[PDB]
Amino acid sequence: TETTSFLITKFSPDQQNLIFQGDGYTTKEKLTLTKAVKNTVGRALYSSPIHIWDRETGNVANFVTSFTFVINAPNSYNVADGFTFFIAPVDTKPQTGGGYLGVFNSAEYDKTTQTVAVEFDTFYNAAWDPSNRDRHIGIDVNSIKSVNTKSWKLQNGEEANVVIAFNAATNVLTVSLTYPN
Amino acid sequence: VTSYTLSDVVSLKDVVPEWVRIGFSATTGAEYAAHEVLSWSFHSELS
Ligand SMILES: OC[C@H]1O[C@H](O)[C@@H](O)[C@@H](O)[C@@H]1O
Ligand SMILES: [Ca+2]
Ligand SMILES: [Mn+2]
Structure with a gap:
């Protein structure tokens, strides 16, 4: 058994257990991740690599994250x-910006990307996003074109509480977003 | 209290390496907004 856990209920200016990329930074x-400025990207990673599955036993980890x-x-x-929560290789670096969310480079399936992300997409990109044009939550696997989505009404400036859990037994990834109002 | 849930099957084992790093990403383009995280917790267990 190998477990990794952490809880940060309030970030600090000197958040050393985090790796920043792009314009990402912490404050009190x-x-x-980004300021309200055009064409930027900001990412933050937890410093320690996480053992998600093991080739030897073929076991996969159960995990849960809340933010x-x-x-x-x-x-x-x-x-x-x-905005997205992602799981990528240890050497992950920002990818294409804008509609690609800094995690992907195309709408086609690219196995070399090796990234799973859960997106909170606020802008309709005709080339791949849902035709209903709604803002949405999406599960992305090696592609900016989600394998599944759910329309979501953005509440500007309101705190969204999210929980993403992965069940190793069923390979089910569950996302849950809740607003106060 | 408004809530949204989504779920699907993801064979993690075939997509990501044995070891990974986790994090957040947010971008802007021709249009934009500020994206911030207020708290974060994580827990994983591999048998
Ligand atoms: O910002 C919205 C939109 O702006 C431009 O069109 C590009 O940067 C797109 O990738 C992005 O999705
Ligand atoms: Ca989009
Ligand atoms: Mn999308």
Whole structure:
């Protein structure tokens, strides 16, 4: 058995157990991925690698993560591009920005990407996003084109409480987003 | 209290390496917004 756990209920200016990439940085209380500026990318990773599955036994880890995020758009109607929770190789680095969310490079399936992400997409990219044009939660596997989505109404500047759990027994990944109001 | 849930099967073993790093990503393009995280917890167990 190998377990890795952590809890950060409030970020600090000197958050040393985190790796920052792009414009990501911490402040007292919050972790900022991007400011309200055009064409940027910000990422933050937990410092320690995590043993997710083992080739020897073929076992896969059960895991659960919870976080609270806030999207603050200065133009409440024109919002882009979104936020994601991802699981990538240990040497992961920012990928294509904009609609690619800094985690992918195309809408086709790329096994070399080796990334699973759960997106909170705020902008409709015609090339791959749902036709209903709704903002949405999506499960991404090696591609920006989600394998499954759920329309979601963004509450500008409101704290979203999220829980993502993975059941090793059933290979079911569950995402859950809740708002106060 | 508004809530949304989504779920699907993901064969992690065939997509990601044995060891991984986890994190958050957020981007802007021609349009934009501030993306922030207020707290974070994680727990994994591999038998
Ligand atoms: O920001 C919205 C949109 O702006 C531009 O069109 C590009 O950067 C896209 O990738 C992005 O999705
Ligand atoms: Ca999009
Ligand atoms: Mn999308």
